[PDB]
Amino acid sequence: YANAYQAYQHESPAKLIEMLYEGILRFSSQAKRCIENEDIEKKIYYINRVTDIFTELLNILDYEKGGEVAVYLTGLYTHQIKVLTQANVENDASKIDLVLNVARGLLEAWREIHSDELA
């Protein structure tokens, strides 16, 4: 799926990505809670934050240096937004699980590559 790369643009750039991926995990997880408890207001909050992140993640991708894996993430992220909008509109928690599983894999991989730095 993904290895041997720096696929983003712009003292430690890697930690920044971890924070964004953690934000997704966190808010997604909080958003799941909210679907279960039926707090709609709180859910729209927590989704829009996850969305804002993927949107950030999309804007700082390097198509030059990131190659095929930059192309793959553009796919991953824009899909992830669509999936998020669906989970929102149609109130599906299995769906937030899909996004969560996704950010976990990314984050695990990202930490694997920056093992010493992200300790």
From TrEMBL:
One of its GO terms (biological process) is bacterial-type flagellum assembly. SUPFAM superfamilies: Flagellar export chaperone FliS. Pfam families: FliS. The keyword rRNA-binding does not apply. InterPro entries: FliS (IPR003713), FliS_sf (IPR036584). The keyword Cytoplasm applies. One of its GO terms (cellular component) is cytosol. It comes from the Bacteria. It is found in: Cytoplasm, Cytosol. Its main location: cytoplasm. Coiled coil: none annotated. Keywords: Bacterial flagellum biogenesis, Cell projection, Chaperone, Cilium, Cytoplasm, Flagellum. CDD domains: FliS. Belongs to the FliS family. PANTHER family: FLAGELLAR SECRETION CHAPERONE FLIS. This is Flagellar secretion chaperone FliS.
